[PDB]
Write a protein that binds this ligand. Structure first.
Ligand SMILES: Cn1cc2c3c(c[nH]c3c1=O)CN(CC1CC1)c1ccc(CS(C)(=O)=O)cc1-2
Length: 107
């Protein structure tokens, strides 16, 4: 699909140096053990991160751009659900979501 190729472009933008200052906590799965977030799995039923989405896209796990978009939004929603609203990581998620929503709207 043409729109799935657009999804590869979306990930390249989200992983780019321009956005690294706020995107970096979303690059890989939340490491509950190293971070001491032992209540994370009690709140978050479906963890998601950018590396997992990249692997799913490459393995043809998304039928269309809407399925890809749902996993990106799941990653943001997990952050908004788990953390207090004033947390530094929530502000970072919002800045990354701005990048994603503007690009996703172009297709
Ligand atoms: C998505 N996310 C991510 C983090 C996180 C934290 C609390 N709540 C979340 C959350 O919701 C603690 N901090 C926040 C960070 C300073 C701004 C870190 C630190 C390192 C990593 C990468 S890792 C591979 O070591 O997990 C992730 C996260």
């Amino acid at each position: 699909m043409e729109q799935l190729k657009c999804c590869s472009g979306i990930l390249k933008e989200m992983f780019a140096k321009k956005h690294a200052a706020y995107a970096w906590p979303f690059y890989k799965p939340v490491d509950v053990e190293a971070l001491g977030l032992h209540d994370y799995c009690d709140i978050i039923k479906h963890p998601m991160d950018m590396s997992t989405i990249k692997s799913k896209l490459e393995a043809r796990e998304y039928r269309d751009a809407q399925e890809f978009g749902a996993d990106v939004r799941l990653m943001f929603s997990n952050c908004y659900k788990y953390n207090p609203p004033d947390h530094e990581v929530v502000a970072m998620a919002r800045k990354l979501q701005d990048v994603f929503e503007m690009r996703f709207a172009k297709m």
